[PDB]
A paper describes a structure:
CT and LT, with their five equivalent binding subunits, are known to be multivalent proteins. Binding has been described as a “two-fingered grip”, provided by the two terminal residues, galactose (Gal) and sialic acid (NeuAc). The specificity of this interaction is mainly determined by the terminal galactose residue, which is buried in a deep pocket at the rugged underside of the toxin (distant from the A-subunit). As expected, all three inhibitors bind in the primary binding site, acting as decoys for the toxins’ main receptor, the GM1 ganglioside.
Compounds 2 and 3 are bidentate ligands that combine the two terminal residues of the GM1 oligosaccharide, i.e. galactose and sialic acid. The cholera toxins come in two varieties: classical (c) and El Tor (ET). The two biotypes differ at two amino acid residues in the B-subunit, 18 and 47 (His18 and Thr47 in cCTB, and Tyr18 and Ile47 in ET CTB). The crystal structures were solved to 1.1 Å resolution and contain one B-pentamer in the asymmetric unit. Both CT variants have well-defined electron density for inhibitor 2 in all binding sites. As in the other structures, the galactose moiety of 2 is buried in the GM1 binding site, H-bonding with Glu51, Gln61, Asn90 and Lys91. The sialic acid residue has direct interactions with the backbones of Glu11 and His13. The differences to GM1-os binding can be seen in the linker region of 2, where the hydrogen bond of the core Gal to the side chain of His13 is no longer achievable. Instead, closer to the terminal Gal, the carbonyl group of the linker engages in a water-mediated interaction to Asn14.
Author numbering:
A (entry chain D), B (entry chain C), C (entry chain B), D (entry chain A), E (entry chain E): 1 to 103
The structure:
């Protein structure tokens, strides 16, 4: 088990770390069918998604996908600094795998 | 997958974008049977619903419909500026498909 | 579909609207068996419940009854003005069907 | 159905009201097996638990037990004044049945 | 039943109490498959995990694992002082069993 997001990120293929050190600029959420997902942006336009649950996900990720969306919404509303995101870069928007926040 | 609420909204029939750039003026919620829903309004009078779950919804939307009502409650209480809504315009009130929030 | 709490409330037998325009004075909730409920009061004396779930309720209302208790707790803690309540008046305390909040 | 926490407390055996009129001093929660529970204390030393769900509880209490842990956490973090607790006094620490909160 | 975290912690094999008396320095959470977890650090460099749900865990712990992650996230965002952690020391990072918070 990893001790930090950078290390956890590197346990997967098709990942990269984005270092933001900034609050979220915009939070978007959708309940439209086949687009049950969230999208966030930062002030420079970099855009990220929490993917729609799909075949690529294993069952244990389902709860976690819901929690991440909970996280992003509260982070946005509290203007919390996001340190890093670990993302899969084989999707557009890059798909969030993990988030770190630090003051 | 879309990168933003406008493009997402364009993936569906019977939808349009409202551009509000304003906080929620009122939040209403009901537990009355066949009316388990939320309704919001803006100061310009525009009124939107989170629809009662119905036969038009697919199963993957049920959790996202609960999430949206969570989101609208917290956005209301935090006076968060709603940027745009993507809504179905074949329902009265217009039915929320997606929301975007930015400063 | 109604557009506001007053019209929604009138879709049911045994309901009325109370107009508070005040924050919640006290919040009470219970885990005791057969009294899994919430009770709120206002400074004017008015007291309301969220009913214990029972067979008077259809299944779709179960989640909304939970949500309503969430809403009342957070509105209490945030000192949010409650505008109106739709209640059933064939219970004592009057049973909450819907709430509206506005500045 | 009762109108207040004292009357509700009186519908059960082995209970009493404690009047705190104070915020919670400490919040403790555990995920260890067989000790899935919450413990709070007040500055006067008084200590209370939300019991581990057990065979004494009826199905309808399960969700209310989770909700009470939620309520205690948020009451702690927001330094909400706890007015009264209804507890069962045949457990040690005394076990929370109900809570009231007021300015 | 125990009345505080130290005594609770002592009812299990392979645990220890860490005393932090400090806010959380960073919160990380992951939805990557097999790494559905949270990791927190403090400014003293100490690092702790909420374990991925696993076969070691009994059924009653699953809800409490989710609750813990909720607790850590909101502790972080409110800059709540963490008093103590009870951890299992047979995992790297040490795995959270229980948390106490006090001003
Ligand atoms: C910590 C750990 O177990 N890491 C392993 C992961 C992991 O088991 C799977 O990602 C969990 O589903 O599986 C890795 C990986 O890099 O993802 N893996 C996966 C596979 C074949 C199946 C596969 O690619 N699953 C990942 C799909 C990806 O799912 C992602 C979401 O979880 C994203 O949607 C991404 O865009 C998609 O490519 N072969 N190796 C190997 C890596 O060592
Ligand atoms: C991104 C994507 O998958 N978009 C597609 C959507 C989508 O698959 C469905 O809406 C998901 O249920 O289905 C589309 C759509 O526009 O909704 N679709 C669906 C259909 C036939 C069935 C249909 O109209 N289902 C949606 C009914 C609408 O449900 C909405 C709620 O989700 C609202 O209640 C709206 O008022 C109602 O008309 N014809 N086209 C085509 C579009 O390309
Ligand atoms: C918008 C809508 O569908 N409104 C209709 C409602 C509604 O279908 C049911 O209340 C939902 O269960 O059912 C109405 C109603 O007024 O409640 N209805 C239902 C009935 C027969 C059964 C009945 O009275 N169910 C409601 C019981 C009430 O449940 C309420 C909780 O939901 C309260 O506990 C109230 O104290 C209790 O009397 N007769 N009229 C007719 C109304 O037009
Ligand atoms: C409003 C209401 O229905 N009140 C009744 C309650 C109630 O039905 C049960 O407590 C719900 O499970 O059941 C009462 C009660 O006082 O608890 N009751 C129940 C019984 C036999 C079974 C019994 O004692 N159940 C309660 C056990 C208590 O559970 C509590 C958790 O809910 C605590 O853990 C407590 O320490 C324990 O003694 N005898 N009286 C009588 C009371 O009038
Ligand atoms: C209050 C109480 O019931 N305490 C008892 C606990 C408890 O029943 C179990 O931990 C609940 O799963 O079980 C104890 C314990 O110390 O864990 N126990 C359990 C066992 C054999 C099975 C066992 O080791 N289960 C715990 C494994 C641990 O699970 C933990 C998560 O819950 C951690 O992942 C930890 O790293 C791992 O070693 N031997 N003693 C004895 C202790 O008296
Ligand atoms: Ca700070
Ligand atoms: Ca204001
Ligand atoms: Ca205000």
């Amino acid at each position: 088990t990893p001790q930090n997001i950078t290390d956890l990120c590197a346990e997967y293929h098709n990942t990269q770390i984005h270092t933001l050190n900034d609050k979220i600029f915009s939070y978007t959420e959708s309940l439209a069918g086949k687009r049950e997902m969230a999208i966030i942006t930062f002030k420079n336009g970099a855009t990220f998604q929490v993917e729609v649950p799909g075949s690529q996900h294993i069952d244990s990720q389902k709860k976690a996908i819901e929690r991440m969306k909970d996280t992003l919404r509260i982070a946005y509303l509290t203007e919390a600094k996001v340190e890093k995101l670990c993302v899969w870069n084989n999707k557009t928007p890059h798909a969030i795998a993990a988030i770190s926040m630090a003051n």
